[PDB]
């Protein structure tokens, strides 16, 4: 295959990472203008973390309890509040490296880059896909909370994920930057299982379009299907149903190849019902579901 | 566990655009020097068979347009070092990191910051293959994008991009302008040597697979280093040296599995196959994680 998981350049986010310490708990925070955003569990002790009373724990905190540092330089906290599972610390200095930015809440299937950070210091960058069960397959060690996920469009950074926890199967969960968890998880030190996962159909379809663009088109059959017929079949193979939004985001690739979205669905349906018959697509007997239609365009054209 | 690139910000602050005629690519601006592939001086007809010393003597400073963002930098000097052009400019780059130029060895990894028109586009990890190609993602206009590693705020630049071979793989130079591999900066079809698999890296990745609880491929058998290497050579894997065995020490100690016992499992994989099963999600043995990468 000529495809890579490619992250966005991380510099505009690196300039925003700080560390936040309460007591002995240190994690990362995101400094945009004069506010630092971080997971609210920084205020917890190990006695509190099994079912912390966050409202009562916060009552006992003052601005002077929070150690915010850019490197070893302390930023003075002048205000604090909690929004869902995120703490917002107002600081007395506006970050001069603040990029143009937005906070967005993504859907399952969408991809984003994660800048993994420890002690406020960026350590690595990689691309993740939000699964249908609202987990991501990250590489996150102790101290990585507050690391963020983002996309960049025309030098505007859209922040979509802030890291909070690791589930029993090793996958990761977190919130948007308004502090609302993706998925049913809660920020307590308790066993919480990731639900059963499914395959991201819209992204498999994008991958089949990528194959066609590259001349690998043996699977294009002569059938079509309806969207409802397809969704009912797909669910029997543990594939996600398509939404109208998914049909629309496939528009550009459909136009580029001249293959109708519903014809491509009929092709995928044959692959599901009959297997690959030993053949390969883009040099693989596995269908790939972590490349979105935008990722394909971002790589096939460019 | 997965493929992770270094944060790219220190490198992003160094990328510029270099133009000569109708040819545009990226340059790397460190202090008062911009480094870029020398083929920027070629027309499309020149590229078919360039005499670079001849083409360069026919150029002056003003044929080179360097843009950092939308601000033009004035070229006040130029020289050629192998396949790299060094343009002296009137301004020092304020964002120059602490840096080194290094030539990497086959099997070692680096991050690539792909750029177009002087602007960073994407970041990903590559390994230098034994045949001195890299499997990257580079399109028209990506030349002059760089590969690098970062160690305690020091950026070690190891790769500058020049070309795509007919098979789709990529080739380029160190920052002294010497190619990795038997390639030349001419617009002509060029094949690489037969590729081989980076054995020490496959072993590192199999250790990662065990640590993550994926163990179906392990066995109670064993092997000597020499007997393993005979099989490796038969399947176009690189030899495993004693230094490689040593480098795998931490991984072997962390798990309970001696290096030569992991070698015995790999031997069976090469001889039997994976039989439709997968390891860490892959249907294929992965050789682009180094031991150090795995330990991070």
From Swiss-Prot, chain A:
Active site: 41, 145
Mutagenesis or variant effect for residue 145 to A: Complete loss of 3C-like proteinase nsp5 cleavage
Segments forming domain Peptidase C30: 1-302
Regulation: Inhibited by pyridone-containing alpha-ketoamides compounds 13a and 13b. In turn, alpha-ketoamide 13b (tert-butyl (1-((S)-1-(((S)-4-(benzylamino)-3,4-dioxo-1-((S)-2-oxopyrrolidin-3-yl)butan-2-yl)amino)-3-cyclopropyl-1-oxopropan-2-yl)-2-oxo-1,2-dihydropyridin-3-yl)carbamate) inhibits SARS-CoV-2 replication in human lung cells. Inhibited ex vivo by michael acceptor inhibitor N3. Inhibited ex vivo by compound 11a and 11b.
Catalyzed chemical reaction(s): TSAVLQ-|-SGFRK-NH2 and SGVTFQ-|-GKFKK the two peptides corresponding to the two self-cleavage sites of the SARS 3C-like proteinase are the two most reactive peptide substrates. The enzyme exhibits a strong preference for substrates containing Gln at P1 position and Leu at P2 position
Ranges of the Cytoplasmic topological domain: 1-302
Residue location of crosslink Glycyl lysine isopeptide (Lys-Gly) (interchain with G-Cter in ubiquitin): 5, 90
Effect of residue 205 to V: In strain: Zeta/P.2
Locations listed in the record: Host cytoplasm; Host Golgi apparatus; Host nucleus
Top-level taxon of the source organism: Viruses
Functional note: Cleaves the C-terminus of replicase polyprotein at 11 sites. Recognizes substrates containing the core sequence [ILMVF]-Q-|-[SGACN]. Cleaves and inactivates human TRMT1, preventing tRNA guanine(26)-dimethylation of tRNAs. May cleave human NLRP1 in lung epithelial cells, thereby activating the NLRP1 inflammasome pathway. May cleave human GSDMD, triggering alternative GSDME-mediated epithelial cell death upon activation of the NLRP1 inflammasome, which may enhance the release interleukins 1B, 6, 16 and 18. Also able to bind an ADP-ribose-1''-phosphate (ADRP).
Subunit structure: 3CL-PRO exists as monomer and homodimer. Only the homodimer shows catalytic activity. Interacts with host FBXO22; this interaction promotes the proteasomal degradation of nsp5.
Name this polypeptide is given: 3C-like proteinase nsp5
Lineage: Viruses, Riboviria, Orthornavirae, Pisuviricota, Pisoniviricetes
């Amino acid at each position: 295959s000529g495809f890579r998981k490619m992250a966005f350049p991380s510099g505009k986010v690196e300039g925003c990472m700080v560390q936040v310490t309460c007591g002995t708990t240190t994690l990362n925070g995101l400094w945009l203008d004069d506010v630092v955003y971080c997971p609210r569990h920084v205020i917890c002790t190990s006695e509190d973390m099994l079912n912390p009373n966050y409202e009562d724990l916060l009552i006992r905190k003052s601005n002077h309890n929070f150690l915010v540092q850019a490197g070893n330089v302390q930023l003075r906290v002048i205000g604090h509040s909690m929004q869902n599972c995120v703490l917002k610390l107002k600081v007395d200095t506006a970050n001069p490296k603040t990029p143009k930015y937005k906070f967005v809440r993504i859907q399952p299937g969408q991809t984003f880059s994660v800048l993994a950070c420890y002690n406020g210091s960026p350590s690595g960058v990689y691309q993740c896909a939000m699964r249908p069960n609202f987990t991501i397959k990250g590489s996150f060690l102790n101290g990585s909370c507050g690391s963020v996920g983002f996309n960049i469009d025309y030098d505007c950074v859209s922040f979509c994920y802030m890291h909070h926890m690791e589930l029993p199967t090793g996958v990761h969960a977190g919130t948007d930057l308004e502090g609302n968890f993706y998925g049913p998880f809660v920020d307590r030190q308790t066993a919480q299982a990731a639900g059963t996962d499914t395959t991201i159909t819209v992204n498999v379809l994008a991958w089949l379009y990528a194959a066609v663009i590259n001349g690998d088109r043996w699977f294009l059959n002569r059938f079509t299907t309806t969207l409802n017929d397809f969704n009912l079949v797909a669910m029997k193979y543990n594939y996600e149903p398509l939404t109208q939004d998914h049909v629309d985001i496939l528009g550009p690739l459909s136009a580029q190849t001249g293959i109708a979205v519903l014809d491509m669905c009929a092709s995928l349906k044959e692959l599901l019902q009959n297997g690959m018959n030993g053949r390969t697509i883009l040099g693989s007997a596995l269908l790939e579901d972590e490349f979105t239609p935008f990722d394909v365009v971002r790589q096939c054209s460019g």
